[PDB]
Design an enzyme around this catalytic site. Structure first.
Site, PDB file in Angstrom:
ATOM      1  N   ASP B   7     -87.591 -29.199  51.483  1.00  0.00           N
ATOM      2  CA  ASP B   7     -87.334 -27.779  51.263  1.00  0.00           C
ATOM      3  C   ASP B   7     -87.256 -27.338  50.013  1.00  0.00           C
ATOM      4  OD1 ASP B   7     -86.484 -25.119  52.327  1.00  0.00           O
ATOM      5  OD2 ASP B   7     -84.603 -25.349  51.267  1.00  0.00           O
ATOM      6  N   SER B   8     -87.391 -25.846  49.609  1.00  0.00           N
ATOM      7  CA  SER B   8     -87.624 -25.473  48.339  1.00  0.00           C
ATOM      8  C   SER B   8     -86.319 -25.413  47.714  1.00  0.00           C
ATOM      9  CB  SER B   8     -88.065 -24.065  48.522  1.00  0.00           C
ATOM     10  OG  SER B   8     -87.758 -23.214  49.557  1.00  0.00           O
ATOM     11  N   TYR B  39     -90.194 -19.998  47.141  1.00  0.00           N
ATOM     12  CA  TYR B  39     -91.560 -20.172  47.304  1.00  0.00           C
ATOM     13  C   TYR B  39     -92.294 -19.139  48.057  1.00  0.00           C
ATOM     14  CZ  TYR B  39     -91.101 -25.562  46.904  1.00  0.00           C
ATOM     15  OH  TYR B  39     -91.239 -26.856  46.551  1.00  0.00           O
ATOM     16  N   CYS B  70     -88.873 -26.298  55.236  1.00  0.00           N
ATOM     17  CA  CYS B  70     -89.243 -25.094  54.669  1.00  0.00           C
ATOM     18  C   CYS B  70     -90.439 -24.391  55.574  1.00  0.00           C
ATOM     19  CB  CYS B  70     -89.893 -25.252  52.975  1.00  0.00           C
ATOM     20  SG  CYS B  70     -90.094 -23.603  52.366  1.00  0.00           S
ATOM     21  N   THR B  72     -92.078 -21.725  54.598  1.00  0.00           N
ATOM     22  CA  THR B  72     -93.084 -21.489  53.574  1.00  0.00           C
ATOM     23  C   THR B  72     -94.017 -22.456  53.402  1.00  0.00           C
ATOM     24  OG1 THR B  72     -91.996 -19.639  52.721  1.00  0.00           O
ATOM     25  CG2 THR B  72     -93.559 -20.563  51.529  1.00  0.00           C
ATOM     26  N   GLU B 150     -78.345 -16.221  49.648  1.00  0.00           N
ATOM     27  CA  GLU B 150     -78.048 -17.250  48.676  1.00  0.00           C
ATOM     28  C   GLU B 150     -76.855 -16.667  47.660  1.00  0.00           C
ATOM     29  OE1 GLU B 150     -82.264 -19.593  48.117  1.00  0.00           O
ATOM     30  OE2 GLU B 150     -81.287 -18.554  46.389  1.00  0.00           O
ATOM     31  N   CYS B 181     -87.681 -18.707  58.785  1.00  0.00           N
ATOM     32  CA  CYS B 181     -87.234 -18.959  57.279  1.00  0.00           C
ATOM     33  C   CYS B 181     -86.033 -19.929  57.264  1.00  0.00           C
ATOM     34  CB  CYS B 181     -86.960 -17.780  56.655  1.00  0.00           C
ATOM     35  SG  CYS B 181     -86.560 -17.653  55.020  1.00  0.00           S
ATOM     36  N   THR B 182     -85.722 -20.769  56.448  1.00  0.00           N
ATOM     37  CA  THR B 182     -84.666 -21.723  56.499  1.00  0.00           C
ATOM     38  C   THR B 182     -83.349 -21.009  56.547  1.00  0.00           C
ATOM     39  OG1 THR B 182     -84.898 -21.886  54.131  1.00  0.00           O
ATOM     40  CG2 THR B 182     -85.551 -23.735  55.523  1.00  0.00           C
ATOM     41  N   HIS B 183     -83.204 -19.760  55.786  1.00  0.00           N
ATOM     42  CA  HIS B 183     -82.009 -19.046  55.456  1.00  0.00           C
ATOM     43  C   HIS B 183     -81.395 -18.087  56.507  1.00  0.00           C
ATOM     44  CE1 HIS B 183     -83.680 -20.169  51.426  1.00  0.00           C
ATOM     45  NE2 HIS B 183     -82.469 -19.524  51.016  1.00  0.00           N
TER      46      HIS B 183
HETATM   47  N1  LIG Z   1     -87.086 -22.267  52.177  1.00  0.00           N
HETATM   48  C1  LIG Z   1     -87.791 -20.887  52.436  1.00  0.00           C
HETATM   49  C2  LIG Z   1     -87.113 -19.857  52.015  1.00  0.00           C
HETATM   50  C3  LIG Z   1     -86.753 -19.977  50.475  1.00  0.00           C
HETATM   51  C4  LIG Z   1     -88.190 -19.872  49.776  1.00  0.00           C
HETATM   52  O1  LIG Z   1     -88.913 -18.939  49.696  1.00  0.00           O
HETATM   53  O2  LIG Z   1     -88.490 -20.722  49.055  1.00  0.00           O
HETATM   54  C5  LIG Z   1     -88.330 -20.771  53.979  1.00  0.00           C
HETATM   55  O3  LIG Z   1     -88.156 -21.298  54.950  1.00  0.00           O
HETATM   56  O4  LIG Z   1     -89.175 -19.967  53.956  1.00  0.00           O
END
Ligand SMILES: N[C@H](CCC(=O)O)C(=O)O
Ligand SMILES: N[C@H](CCC(=O)O)C(=O)O
Lengths: 255, 255
Positions: B7-8, B39, B70, B72, B150, B181-183
């Site tokens: 993950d990012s 990312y 991730c 992204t 975050e 998206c992970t968040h």
């Molecule tokens: N991990 C990214 C979110 C954070 C990022 O943009 O790096 C996603 O799931 O899209």
């Protein structure tokens, strides 16, 4: 002369806008670490390494001076970068302290410092300000301002709500606000409008622009004419897609 | 079976949460590129290189399967990564489509896809959904959700206003919402509440969770039982300060 400007991304254009306005340098090499921005939400160790790495990027460009337009980089990696440098490295923090000293006589004047989490946590502005006698100082990390501004959310309900979120807990109405971040100039009027409106002030507090301050410092030290050059050549470089960074240069540099 | 999770940053912990609950693997190596997060606001070329670099980090750890948590990285670099790797690489996009196929019989059901700008720009979800015959799809880049989450802004006026800023322009009330998206799982209840409140619904739209979707896909593809250690071996790695990465885990693994 030929100089280099370093920032985490496109925020540093706020400083480049100032530098250009002053017509101090003939050639400017701007480097934005757009692949890793932002720096403000990260740790000291990581940021210092980013600072040293920015050095490697300029070494072959043959710049006579390097401006660290980033307030976060200036607060955490300036020291190291300078230790390792055949040339002078000027950050945007110290120059703002000098701007305050001559613009704010009263040492008891309420000063509010705005910046990234990293910049505020470093006490960089707090340390520098106290040394100059100031006793009424407050610090505030306004991190969401950065992404809001990069989304070009410069007005409206969302921005107002974000400012209200960050400014509500403040204990003292600032008389002076330092824009200790490259992006903040883009919402300067909005910040002024917030305090004037929420506290019914006839006039807004005084805002210190990092770009305008460093310009005053560079015009003094390294004495330079206010038009020592006509059309300055500018190079844009980025760790991310340089086309994406150059496209924003248009928007940020625009009047 | 020893696996890697990429993950990012800390957002991938939402997938780690699902993996842990299902008890499929005895060993998990988590790597978050925290020095370079996010990312989603960056370009395809930059993201693709980050993906390949994630593979270089994992090679030494000898993992048998790599989960790209991730969304992204999954949208932009999954193909390139799978090409230069001998081990299976699974992203969080396709599993979501497979989960929808199974949960949404009406090909006409209005589906809303939320993700980063880069994820939405790639049209990865759009193309995968259409292949399965879905005809009523909307896509929305809700970039600010990431930084809000975050900073742990999971309630209050700022989150409501940000949600309203992105959702109000929607022309159709979704029946299905993909948390691409992970968040987003962290504000899943808030998003459900938004639509139930604003459209007077007795029940919220169905939200598709990326983590649960890939865990389900993995569980079936490899016919895995839910009998791995209740407290498996988990290693945390980060490009930024790993202490900062780890201390955030509880925000995501929490209950
Ligand atoms: N991990 C990214 C979110 C954070 C990022 O943009 O790096 C996603 O799931 O899209
Ligand atoms: N350039 C940074 C803002 C963006 C970042 O966090 O890197 C600063 O002046 O603090």
């Amino acid at each position: 002369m030929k100089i280099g400007v370093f920032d985490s991304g496109v925020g540093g254009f706020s400083v480049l806008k100032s530098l250009l306005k002053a017509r101090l340098f003939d050639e400017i090499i701007y480097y934005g670490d757009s692949a890793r921005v932002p720096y403000g939400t990260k740790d000291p160790t990581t940021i210092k390494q980013f600072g040293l790495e920015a050095l490697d990027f300029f070494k072959p460009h043959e710049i006579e001076l390097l401006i660290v337009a980033c307030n976060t980089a200036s607060a955490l990696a300036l020291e190291e970068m300078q230790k390792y440098s055949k040339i002078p490295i000027v950050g945007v923090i110290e120059p703002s302290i000098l701007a305050i000293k001559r613009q704010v006589e009263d040492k008891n004047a309420p000063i509010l410092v705005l910046g990234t989490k990293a910049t505020i946590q470093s006490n960089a502005y707090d340390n520098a300000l106290k040394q100059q006698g100031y006793l009424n100082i407050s610090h505030l990390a306004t991190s969401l301002f950065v992404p809001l501004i990069e989304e070009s959310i410069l007005e409206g309900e969302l921005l107002e709500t974000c400012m209200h979120y960050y400014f509500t807990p403040l204990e003292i109405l600032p008389e002076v606000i330092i824009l200790g971040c490259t992006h903040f100039p883009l919402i300067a009027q909005k910040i002024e409008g917030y305090f004037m409106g929420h506290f019914a002030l006839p006039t807004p507090p005084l805002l210190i622009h990092s770009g305008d301050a460093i310009v005053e410092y560079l015009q003094q030290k390294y004495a330079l004419k206010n038009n020592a050059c006509t059309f300055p050549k500018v190079e844009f470089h980025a760790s991310g897609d340089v086309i994406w960074l150059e496209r924003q240069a248009k928007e940020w540099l625009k009047l």
